[PDB]
Every structure is written in C-alpha cells, then in structure tokens.
C-alpha cells in the first residue's frame, strides 16, 4: 500500500504477512458471507492494484469464485474504457491498467500520486467488491 510517512511524503510499503493471514482467515471463517466485504476494505487501506492482486491471489484456489470475480472485473474494465477512453509525460490508465494486468507498480503509484490523481487502487477495489457481492449471491 501507499502510506504517508512522518514527514508527509507518500511512500510505498509491502503488505505484511499478518495482513495476508487475516485476509485468508476472514475469507474462510466467514466463507460466503457479506461480512467478508467490510473486512476486505479494512485490510486493503491504501492498496495499489498490485496489492489487491496479491490479496486475491492468496485466495485464488477457489475456482468458481475467482471465475465470477474475473468476469466481473472484465466487465468493469470494459465500462471504464467506455467512460474514460484514452486519447515528464504520463499515459492515462485503461481498464486493464486499473486491474493491474497491463500496468507496472511504478505506473500505478504514478497515477495515484499524480497531480491531479487517478486513484486506480480505489477504483479497482470497487470492481472487486462488486465481484465479492456476486460471490455472496452465487453461494446464497
């Protein structure tokens, strides 16, 4: 995630094992429950798209759930491209860039800290939450 240090600068730091552990814990302890969703938000504060993918991959053995998530992400990325088509320079992010599949961590941090910013982590996070809601329904 990207966090503000003591001075006031925005610095990147890795996800802790503790955080990844708590995430796997909640996904399984509360499997199928929407209770998982606010915990996802809590555990992913300041997350970049790469971070979100690390979290998803740690629970990536769930075949049907991951497939539902993937198709949701694909749909949202397509809608992003419709809503915001791409026309010290910096290229603008496309749907696949927000999902972290075609962008580097450097590029993601660049967008998030740009003036003015595009919070690609927060955007991707919403797509994932859409997916999580659909997983709840698929297993209701």
Ligand X SMILES: CCc1cc(-c2ccc(C)o2)n(-c2ccc3c(c2)nc(-c2cc(C(=O)O)ccc2O)n3Cc2ccc(=O)[nH]c2)n1
Ligand Y SMILES: O=C(O)c1ccc(-c2ccc3c(c2)nc(-c2cn[nH]c2-c2cccc(Cl)c2)n3CCCn2ccnc2)cc1
Binding positions for ligand X, rule: CB under 6 A: 27-28, 31-33, 36-37, 56, 59, 62, 65-66, 69, 132, 135-136
Write down the least CB distance from residue 55 to ligand X, Å: 8
Q: Which is nearer to ligand X, 12 or 134 (CB)?
A: 134
The answer to whether residues 121 and 112 touch, using CB atoms and an 8 Å cutoff, is yes
At 85, list the tokens.
Answer: 């088509």
Write down the least CB distance from residue 13 to ligand X, Å: 23
What is d(CA 98, CA 82) in angstroms, rounded to the nearest whole number? 14
Which residues have a Cβ under 8 Å from the Cβ of 13 and sit 6 or more positions away? 1, 2, 3
Residue ranges that bind ligand Y, judged by CB under 6 A: 84, 90, 92, 111, 114, 116-119, 122-123
């Amino acid at each position: 995630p990207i966090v503000q240090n003591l001075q006031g600068q925005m610095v990147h730091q890795a996800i802790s094992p503790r955080t990844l552990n708590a995430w796997v814990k909640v996904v399984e302890e509360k499997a199928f429950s929407p209770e998982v969703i606010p915990m996802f938000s809590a555990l992913s504060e300041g997350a970049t798209p790469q971070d979100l993918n690390t979290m998803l991959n740690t629970v990536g053995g769930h075949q049907a759930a991951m497939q539902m998530l993937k198709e949701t992400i694909n749909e949202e990325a397509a809608e992003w491209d419709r809503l915001h088509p791409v026309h010290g320079q910096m290229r603008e992010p496309r749907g696949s860039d927000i999902a972290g599949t075609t962008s580097t961590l450097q590029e993601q941090i660049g967008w998030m800290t740009h003036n003015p910013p595009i919070p690609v982590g927060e955007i991707y996070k919403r797509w994932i939450i859409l997916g999580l809601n659909k997983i709840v329904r698929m297993y209701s």
